[PDB]
Amino acid sequence: GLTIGVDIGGTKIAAGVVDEEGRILSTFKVATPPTAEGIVDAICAAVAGASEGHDVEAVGIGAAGYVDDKRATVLFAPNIDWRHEPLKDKVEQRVGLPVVVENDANAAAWGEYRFGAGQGHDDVICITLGTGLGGGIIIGNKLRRGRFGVAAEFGHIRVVPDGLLCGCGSQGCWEQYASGRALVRYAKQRANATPENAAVLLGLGDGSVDGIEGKHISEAARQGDPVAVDSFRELARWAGAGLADLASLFDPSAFIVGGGVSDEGELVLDPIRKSFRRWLIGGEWRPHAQVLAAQLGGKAGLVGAADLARQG
Amino acid sequence: GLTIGVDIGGTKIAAGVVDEEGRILSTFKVATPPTAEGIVDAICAAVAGASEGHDVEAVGIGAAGYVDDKRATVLFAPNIDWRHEPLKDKVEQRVGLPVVVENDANAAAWGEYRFGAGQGHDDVICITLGTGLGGGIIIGNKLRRGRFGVAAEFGHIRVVPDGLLCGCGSQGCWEQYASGRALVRYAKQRANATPENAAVLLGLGDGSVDGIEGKHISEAARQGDPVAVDSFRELARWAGAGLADLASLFDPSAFIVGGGVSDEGELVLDPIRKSFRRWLIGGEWRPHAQVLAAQLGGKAGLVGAADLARQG
Amino acid sequence: GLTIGVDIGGTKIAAGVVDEEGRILSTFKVATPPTAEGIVDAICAAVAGASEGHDVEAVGIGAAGYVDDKRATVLFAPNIDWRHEPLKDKVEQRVGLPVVVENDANAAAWGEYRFGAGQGHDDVICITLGTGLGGGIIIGNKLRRGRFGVAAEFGHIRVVPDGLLCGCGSQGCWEQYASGRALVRYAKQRANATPENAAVLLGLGDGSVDGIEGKHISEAARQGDPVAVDSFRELARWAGAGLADLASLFDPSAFIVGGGVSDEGELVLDPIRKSFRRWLIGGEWRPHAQVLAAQLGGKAGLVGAADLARQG
Amino acid sequence: GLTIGVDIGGTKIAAGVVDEEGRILSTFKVATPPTAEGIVDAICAAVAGASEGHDVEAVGIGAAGYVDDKRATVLFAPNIDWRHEPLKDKVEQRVGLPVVVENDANAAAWGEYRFGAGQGHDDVICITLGTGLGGGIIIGNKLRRGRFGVAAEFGHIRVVPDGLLCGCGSQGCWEQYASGRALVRYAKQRANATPENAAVLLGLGDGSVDGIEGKHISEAARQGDPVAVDSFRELARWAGAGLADLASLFDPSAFIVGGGVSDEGELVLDPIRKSFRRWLIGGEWRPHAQVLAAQLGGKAGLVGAADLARQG
Ligand SMILES: OC[C@H]1O[C@@H](O)[C@H](O)[C@@H](O)[C@@H]1O
Ligand SMILES: OC[C@H]1O[C@@H](O)[C@H](O)[C@@H](O)[C@@H]1O
Ligand SMILES: OC[C@H]1O[C@@H](O)[C@H](O)[C@@H](O)[C@@H]1O
Ligand SMILES: OC[C@H]1O[C@@H](O)[C@H](O)[C@@H](O)[C@@H]1O
Ligand code: NA
Ligand code: NA
Ligand code: NA
Ligand code: NA
Ligand SMILES: [Zn+2]
Ligand SMILES: [Zn+2]
Ligand SMILES: [Zn+2]
Numbered sequence A, B, C, D: 001g002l003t004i005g006v007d008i009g010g011t012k013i014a015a016g017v018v019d020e021e022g023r024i025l026s027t028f029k030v031a032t033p034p035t036a037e038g039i040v041d042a043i044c045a046a047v048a049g050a051s052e053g054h055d056v057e058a059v060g061i062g063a064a065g066y067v068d069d070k071r072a073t074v075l076f077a078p079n080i081d082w083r084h085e086p087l088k089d090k091v092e093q094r095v096g097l098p099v100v101v102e103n104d105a106n107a108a109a110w111g112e113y114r115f116g117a118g119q120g121h122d123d124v125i126c127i128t129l130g131t132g133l134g135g136g137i138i139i140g141n142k143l144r145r146g147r148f149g150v151a152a153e154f155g156h157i158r159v160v161p162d163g164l165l166c167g168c169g170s171q172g173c174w175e176q177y178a179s180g181r182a183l184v185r186y187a188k189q190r191a192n193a194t195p196e197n198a199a200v201l202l203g204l205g206d207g208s209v210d211g212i213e214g215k216h217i218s219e220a221a222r223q224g225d226p227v228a229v230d231s232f233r234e235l236a237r238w239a240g241a242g243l244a245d246l247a248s249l250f251d252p253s254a255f256i257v258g259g260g261v262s263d264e265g266e267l268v269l270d271p272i273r274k275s276f277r278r279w280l281i282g283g284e285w286r287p288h289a290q291v292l293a294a295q296l297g298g299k300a301g302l303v304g305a306a307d308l309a310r311q312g
């Protein structure tokens, strides 16, 4: 039958009814509230909104945090105020439907494996670029959550010793260098330094550096705004180097890049792919994985979460 | 029946006859020669020496390099002169027994999973500390080699951007910071700076910095030589931080540390474990893997390689 | 005659009447307000308070920012809201006395050269550890401010490429790794990870991590609190490595460490000195500078600023 | 009258007779031999060759190492086998003329200050890019050697913690990232990865990566060889970032870039200057130094050394 998927990210909540073939039948979006209690309210509003007109059997939540092996509790989140949050229990008692809670990028990996760019592969690795950087692991045709449920937390691999402060409480985490937030940071740095090379970018906002938004950077880069193009170059430096490290770790047939910015397709995927190829160890002597945009784009997580609910 | 395992590392070749329960029935050791042709000669000598007195059915090779998915060819090695080396074919035609070629640390992981510290677990990660740093992945009770056979090359994950030159041709690789060679480097740095704190260490060699060998550092640290103890501290800084990154990646129930220096047990494992716990993301909010010495120590690879031959 | 020195730091304003031999005759302290206009008010209050009972001829300001070659304007400050601030003009029109504006750590260097640990030397380098990290250069018995007045901004030398965000707008600046603020950061990190090793430290505050203050860390370290001792070790790692770089740059006869934490003397100077000696290039082949506490401690800047006013 | 200058670098020895206006009247070049005794022989050959036809009064040596405050002894050299080498005494007894020994880049700074790009300035900083990276400091119209003679060893400032091994015995030194040797390294890395983008570069040598020489990279970049252009970009990343750090340290009116590659002028200076401006702290709020090629190019050191002999 039909289930609902709800993707709860640091910035946005998105929900939809999803059928057995991963077709999205409805859309609901709302901003992620700042408190755990407000988030439960918003989840309920999202489920109610997306469910309009449809007979719904279960709810799958893709949550932006460390989710336990029982798929019920958000143990820890760097960019949302969740600490040992019993999300399954709270949502079940309010919506009156069975709920499964999965990590958001685990869910995106699953969505792409079933219905997107991972179809036909056995071993694929997903990264999502958004508020943070999430990971998802498909090995031997199965999602791998690890012993304690918290595998694929790629965003907190240390890429710069003693580097940037992260929401997780550590320093130098990959997500501080490769994420939608990092992209925005790169563009604001560059627009502040050389505003004369950011005219198009600034014109898409309110004209100020502070008014630069992720989607502006994408549109401006399409139009050839040098500062926007350079910001994507910097994002790709770190995203591609990290994908090369993931090739050393997992050696998959494909990497699948999701998150909101993956909606931009080759605009972001081409520099990431080129960077991956520059960083891949062993030069000419070893094979290279494909580097692919999430076919479902930013919706992969809600689709995968919906489908993971259906297999409950 | 009985098979032979041969572990070919950057420094040493070790072979032995191994029974069905992973008992080692014979030992042969020789230094790794500098050329690929000399290595084939040494493999043949090792097989002949270890095989004395025993009826042997197959040969498993654990090779210190990137091994292909067909388990026959060393694609690339950073510390041995192998480039697309058809090791299976060359050894088969000379010994007249079936041969399987596996990566050495893949083989160590398998040996520990079957006969050592990984028994009873479903998801474990092995690192070996030796000439280089090797990895091995057991997920869902199975060795995972990846799409192209070259998963678990943990030694070439970039831990320091623009860092130390590595034999793989890249910079900043984990193995330049955590390996037996790195340990020796740390001790020589420290003994050169403060020889008065290295009296015991230098006394175990020829009295010179250049004469410091890995095994001297271990023995000296047991005796409380401050420079040797400090060198183990530095090795553990990098080994433990990397294990914390592997927890972010794989979230296994256990890490198993092998390689020659794992022969030292808690001398090296205790600082590595303590370091792992200091670096593990998420503080009190998430569970910690065990950090264990390879029960087979430096012999895990030959045992695992022997057993992988038997399942051919 | 007598002049007033006023040291305006990121956290504190301190003023005093200073005689010709650098004796401090009065003390006034107030917290640094958050706005430039509030700071001018506070400077006036500090001058009035310190001046009680004394015939005062001039005012010297040691300001925590980039000061111009005319010694009148704060061009830029990372931790105070000053941008092209005409501090000399604003204070002169309100106090009715001649004013000279110097960088705070330039003033501290001068105070120590004239009246403190730099006496008898010709070439000394000062660093101050406080809200930020400041520098001061004495070469050939003269304070060196550079062509544009902004020499000795040692706090913004990049020590970690792509490292921690700094108030100056760049990343990886020395002051993010060595300063009083960094010390507090190190202690809060360590007390959060292992509170059982921070009992004494937490007991000196309100019992919480958030309640840890710099002075608590110092007192706790004196009492042997392991977390406090470890925090000083981490501060010294970065402070000493940077002093070794300054030896490569300037090769002075002495380094003088000032700022509020220098009030602690050998508690902080001993680990910094030991670290300096570990990092100094060239081992046994080259001589080492002295590493000394500011004899005037945190008051060096106000003394030096007072004296720089007198030579106007 | 006339003196001889001799510049002894890691790769090359160059000598010439120099008049009072810094005009070079003769040229002699020979490769730097591998032993200290062979170097003294080569110095004597260089002095004899350059002196042909000329009445010579003194010899100034610009030596690529840490030179003492007495200007007589090479205390330490990272790229030449000198340890406490009494160069003045050895050369004086063999040539029978007075000798002064200065650091090579100190001598280059002096040559440029007197006869080149530093004319008219009071405070300038020189870096030389060659076998290593050297520095020279002019402050208040005077060369500054520091208390122990070893100021301006900019090549061994640590730019990457735990970075590349340096000849000085430390890691992460600036000279491993910015020097002629680093340039060659960058080009060989890039030509090995993408030889199809290095056709012109490889054609100027023997066609192999191993045959790439510094001068080939320069010529190829002029012709628009993408790999050569990219190598200069990478050199400039590190050289410019370091110059921005030197602006924080010294705030001079000008930086002067010397060494053999400075012979190329704007080919290398333009990317270095642009990089400097990108990295300079404080954006629009503070003034920028000039970044200039050594007017004497690679000959600055021999000219400056000759002139420093004349002021003995
Ligand atoms: O939302 C993307 C990712 O953000 C990271 O900060 C969280 O640790 C992950 O659990 C999540 O998958
Ligand atoms: O021998 C340990 C490891 O050394 C590394 O340098 C090689 O890349 C690996 O394949 C090997 O497992
Ligand atoms: O207050 C100490 C130092 O703090 C730094 O952040 C400022 O840039 C310096 O100008 C000041 O000397
Ligand atoms: O030759 C350039 C520079 O090379 C460096 O390696 C040496 O330490 C310096 O003394 C010298 O000036
Ligand atoms: Na995940
Ligand atoms: Na492996
Ligand atoms: Na200063
Ligand atoms: Na010099
Ligand atoms: Zn993190
Ligand atoms: Zn490597
Ligand atoms: Zn800064």
Ligand SMILES: [Zn+2]
Pocket: D078, D155, D156, D166, D167, D168, D169, D170, D173, D175
């Ligand atoms: Zn060095």
